[PDB]
């Protein structure tokens, strides 16, 4: 019935611009390779068990759900259920494996895949099938060029209808929102530069962040840097999107262990244990892939998911102390403030202008960098969000730790152009 | 907490060799096109609603789960949750849509993806979060060459480890089993020819079957036909697999509406309604993608799933009156009889030699053709299996209707080389 976060793990998120990423320019180029999807999933499953107190007793996990979007394209690998079952002892041939024969599957809803894993794992916990579940999200996207990656990520779009917009289909869909947003004075490209400045400043305090080592001023984020190019091909939307407005092409993983009251009891924990966080509610809303709303200024689907979650938890947005939102673009972060309801329609700009969502603000958002600086390994992201609220609640975030420990948090995870949304309310214990 | 099949729908399964498939050789070549994935999903969702009594009240469905393996490769399209949400009114611009904002997602575990959609839907029904769910499985595989297709289906294998075996990786993995099976006298290539003779004879009575129009004798299935080629490239395994031993590359869909007692109440039905079949149990077992058991003569994972399901429903294999099993190859059907437990280890051969699993036998299996003749649109298969037991129980199968209406049935759906398995026990009402 009730559901608890017992622990979890986030890998460093890596790609171009991280010193952890091996390219023709890294001391180990030709000597060592970046992790494969299998290696990331192994590290993520192992790390999750290690930081959840399950070492030696991994057999008490009832089910495993993997969130992943594009493994079949980037890594030529689907069927990650049995890859997850083999991840606890990966590379140790013939070893005993307590996860053998357990239920496992992959779920997918574009960049909401990790959020969907969490809900699926929660349904299992409330259904009689499971008392302890492991939800892991992983992605490897660095194995193709930027343009090829665009085409792959267009699988999140209505591909027949939208791939034609630009090779960078998904960035073009958000540039298209921005043109409409600017035409209705909803917010500006100066506002979106401010989101980016905050994300990179936050990421500079987060050693796991893809962009940890990159420092960017507001001025650079606002286009006073010749390398911050307007890179789209589509001439209708090109002027509305800069490089710094975009989430990173990252590899990484995140996992969480979730338990109901009987799972806690099996682990020797009581529901009042101060290492725990309760998932007070979770909700999913999905719209029509084939049709878009006219009002680009409103993410109606994300707004539905958040309102369902907040209502199920019996709280209002003003009760929230921290959030993680889906900043796949700076443009999206701004819309997410309004979808979540921490700003009224047309007032996200007030928040970003007054610093309310910065680390020292009254409602910090994406405290570790978001998709923009922390990075965006698609499948991992939904779970990374849950774990970031958890980490702030437990005082674990070091240089980006909030000074006032948050009592209530929310997540809002999105797939595609606001076509899938998953939202959770977390309560600190 | 109880779960009922209310109704469902299966499309014709189409591909090369069906008269319903449009190729340079069909009267409508150049005039009409085969369905796209979107069109198949539209037809399947609409048909499932229609045949389940939900037309005009589609809004009482709480959520949709889609099973699909390779859409992101064959159709450049992932994110099928929102595609499913737009499927009821697909092609009708701006129409009212009662499915808007409902939860939806895609699940995947290779050729067990449909079976996984059913389990996920059932978890929702038992957890408080749904009373009526739609589980739909769809696949389109006719959009690539055989060899490109082969590489795509290799996403079911451990791609790094196994892709090198043959361009037809997955077939080769079953040819490899057959070599070991022959070496241990477990069963013979005559036995596997007998499975195929049965599938095609059954398919000839099924107008939805991909191979409905193809008649094949035992002798042809046993290699007395020059066109029944041993097509593998790998010289170690080549001699152990004929064309007629393989499932079809098919396009199609299947859907089912599942409800709990409160769902039945909302639809105006009672749990004793003669249009219903109860799912007495369902189980999933997943093994290690990276490691294979020595004994090719046993599908351990599938055996685990079926034993779990039978045990949960409190029955034995001898109680079963009908079964649908995963005949991705003739070789697999034989192993499935032993995994399901209708034959003891080493005795599947007794069953196929005596006709026990034919339409007139005491335990008819794959009454409509199986994956071999009915066809294998990957994602649909797990749900087609459920709907075929349902159809036999309700007397709906016409020329392949069993003379004795079955009281108990079992499904066994498998992903990859026995790495994921889903098994259900159905009870006629
Ligand atoms: Cl996405
Ligand atoms: Cl498969």
């Amino acid at each position: 019935s009730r559901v608890f976060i017992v622990g979890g793990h986030i890998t460093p998120f890596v790609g171009k611009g991280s010193p952890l990423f091996i390219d023709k320019k890294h001391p180990d180029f030709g000597k060592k390779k970046n992790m494969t999807l299998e290696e990331i999933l192994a590290t993520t499953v192992q790390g999750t068990m290690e930081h959840s107190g399950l070492s030696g007793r991994e057999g008490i996990v009832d089910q495993v759900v993997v969130g992943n979007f594009l493994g079949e394209l980037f890594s030529s690998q689907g069927h990650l259920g049995p890859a997850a079952i083999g991840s606890l002892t990966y590379g140790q041939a013939g070893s005993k494996n307590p996860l053998m024969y357990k239920p496992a599957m992959r779920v997918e809803g574009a960049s909401a895949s990790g959020g969907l894993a969490v809900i699926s794992a929660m349904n299992a916990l409330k259904s009689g099938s499971a008392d302890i579940t492991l939800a892991v999200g992983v992605e490897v996207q660095t194995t193709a060029s930027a343009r090829v990656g665009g085409d792959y990520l267009a699988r999140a779009a209505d591909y027949q209808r939208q791939r034609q917009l630009d090779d960078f289909t998904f960035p073009c869909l958000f540039a298209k929102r921005m043109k409409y947003i600017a035409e209705h004075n909803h917010f500006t490209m100066e506002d979106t530069a401010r989101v980016a400045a905050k994300a990179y400043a936050n990421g500079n305090k987060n050693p796991l962040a893809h962009m940890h080592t990159r420092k960017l001023t507001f001025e650079q984020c606002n286009g006073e840097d010749p390398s911050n190019v307007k890179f789209l091909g589509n001439e209708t939307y090109k002027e509305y999107l800069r490089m710094t407005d975009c989430s990173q092409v990252s590899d990484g993983g995140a996992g969480v262990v979730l338990a109901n009251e009987e799972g806690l009891r099996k682990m020797g924990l009581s529901p009042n244990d101060s290492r725990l966080v309760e998932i007070k509610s979770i909700a999913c809303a999905v719209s029509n892939l084939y049709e878009d709303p006219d009002d680009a200024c409103c993410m109606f689907t994300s707004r539905q998911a958040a309102q369902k979650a907040l209502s199920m938890a019996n709280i209002k947005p003003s009760d929230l102390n921290v959030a993680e939102v889906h900043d796949c673009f700076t443009i999206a972060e701004m819309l997410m403030y309004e979808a979540l309801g921490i700003a009224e329609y047309g007032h996200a700009k007030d928040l970003i202008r007054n610093g309310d969502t910065t680390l020292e603000g009254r409602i910090p958002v994406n405290t570790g960098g978001g998709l923009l600086s922390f990075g965006h390994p698609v499948g991992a992201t939904g779970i990374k969000q849950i774990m970031e609220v958890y980490r702030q609640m437990k005082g674990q975030c070091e240089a980006y730790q909030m000074k006032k420990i948050p009592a209530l948090g929310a997540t809002l995870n999105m797939g595609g152009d606001d076509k899938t949304a998953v939202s959770a309310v977390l309560q600190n214990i």
Side-chain angles (χ1 to χ4, degrees), chain A:
Chain A
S1 181
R2 298 166 74 196
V3 172
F4 302 86
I5 301 159
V6 173
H9 176 78
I10 307 171
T11 72
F13 286 5
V14 309
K16 284 149 195 145
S18 165
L20 297 185
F21 182 67
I22 298 158
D23 50 13
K24 299 144 64 68
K25 251 144 194 169
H26 184 285
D28 310 355
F29 180 85
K31 297 166 170 57
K32 285 179 153 191
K33 288 171 167 181
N34 299 126
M35 281 191 193
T36 62
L37 187 60
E38 297 96 320
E39 293 171 323
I40 287 167
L41 184 62
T43 313
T44 304
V45 168
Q46 286 167 32
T48 305
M49 295 295 98
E50 292 165 23
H51 295 100
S52 296
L54 285 166
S55 292
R57 53 171 172 178
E58 297 89 341
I60 75 173
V61 172
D62 297 310
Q63 310 199 352
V64 182
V65 184
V66 178
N68 178 82
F69 185 26
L70 298 170
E72 294 184 7
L73 290 173
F74 283 107
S75 290
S76 308
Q77 189 57 75
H79 213 182
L80 295 171
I85 300 301
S87 289
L88 186 62
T89 62
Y90 183 67
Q92 292 178 118
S95 161
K96 293 220 95 170
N97 179 2
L99 299 174
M100 284 282 321
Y101 304 131
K102 288 177 184 300
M105 69 175 180
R106 186 265 290 227
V107 299
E108 182 267 299
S111 291
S113 297
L116 293 173
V118 170
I119 293 180
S120 297
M122 290 177 63
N123 283 344
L125 292 172
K126 293 178 192 280
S127 74
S129 305
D131 301 321
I132 300 172
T133 58
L134 170 70
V136 294
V138 292
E139 205 83 42
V140 167
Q141 307 175 269
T142 55
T143 53
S145 67
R147 277 180 190 282
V148 171
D151 176 71
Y152 290 177
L153 282 326
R155 268 64 167 177
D158 176 347
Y159 187 97
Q160 280 196 257
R161 185 172 62 97
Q162 296 175 306
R163 172 58 181 86
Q164 58 70 23
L165 295 165
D166 197 279
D167 293 343
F168 301 115
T169 307
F170 193 57
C172 199
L173 288 158
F174 272 83
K176 171 174 182 299
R177 289 188 177 266
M178 193 60 231
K179 178 178 182 288
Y180 186 100
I181 283 163
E183 287 164 353
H184 295 76
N185 270 255
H186 209 258
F187 53 86
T188 77
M189 295 184 65
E190 187 181 293
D191 293 320
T192 54
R194 291 188 193 284
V195 171
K198 171 185 69 88
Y200 283 80
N202 282 358
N204 296 331
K205 304 173 166 51
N206 182 8
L208 300 170
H210 182 160
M211 294 292 149
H212 180 55
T213 65
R214 182 166 295 164
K215 304 194 191 192
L216 288 177
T217 61
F218 163 76
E219 288 77 23
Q220 295 172 278
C221 292
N222 204 28
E224 307 186 27
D225 180 320
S227 52
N228 192 15
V229 154
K230 299 203 203 323
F231 63 89
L232 287 173
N234 187 309
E235 286 175 340
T236 309
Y237 304 117
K238 181 169 181 141
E239 288 312 296
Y240 298 95
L241 196 66
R242 303 157 294 206
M243 288 285 288
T244 61
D245 290 315
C246 300
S247 65
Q248 303 312 321
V249 174
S250 314
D251 298 342
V256 63
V257 172
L258 303 167
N260 59 28
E261 293 168 65
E262 178 60 25
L264 293 180
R265 188 202 66 68
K266 295 169 66 154
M267 295 185 70
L269 301 157
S270 135
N272 310 127
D273 196 291
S274 69
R275 292 163 299 178
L276 300 180
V277 164
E278 177 163 15
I279 303 186
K280 208 75 190 319
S281 64
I282 192 164
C284 174
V286 181
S287 57
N288 185 343
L289 187 63
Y290 308 128
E291 276 185 26
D292 303 335
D294 292 343
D295 188 3
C297 296
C298 186
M299 282 189 332
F300 293 95
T301 305
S302 294
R303 189 169 79 181
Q304 275 278 129
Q307 286 180 1
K308 285 181 192 181
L310 290 165
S311 166
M312 296 160 67
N314 197 31
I315 62 157
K316 320 165 310 211
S318 48
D319 300 324
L320 297 173
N321 303 117
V322 65
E324 282 276 323
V325 306
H326 208 271
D327 60 318
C328 50
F329 302 89
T330 44
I331 301 160
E333 176 148 343
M334 298 289 288
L335 290 167
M336 283 278 160
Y337 294 168
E338 300 185 4
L340 186 49
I342 62 169
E344 299 193 9
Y345 181 84
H347 290 93
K349 67 190 181 179
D350 303 346
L351 269 46
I352 203 70
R353 285 174 196 188
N354 72 17
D356 287 325
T357 66
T358 57
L359 266 184
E360 308 81 10
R362 58 175 180 75
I363 178 49
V365 181
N366 299 353
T367 60
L371 288 62
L372 291 163
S373 170
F374 205 149
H376 191 205
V378 177
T381 284
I383 296 163
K384 176 229 71 182
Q385 293 183 331
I386 295 291
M387 283 301 297
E388 289 291 280
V389 179
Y390 168 89
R391 275 157 47 77
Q392 288 289 2
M393 288 184 165
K394 293 305 108 165
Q396 289 172 21
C397 290
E398 306 202 62
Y400 70 98
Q401 181 64 42
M402 292 171 53
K403 291 183 187 331
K404 185 163 90 158
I405 297 300
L408 288 162
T411 63
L412 196 40
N413 186 37
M414 175 178 71
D417 180 15
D418 194 42
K419 303 295 195 194
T420 296
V422 171
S423 187
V425 174
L426 276 54
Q427 158 97 254
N428 201 348
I429 295 163

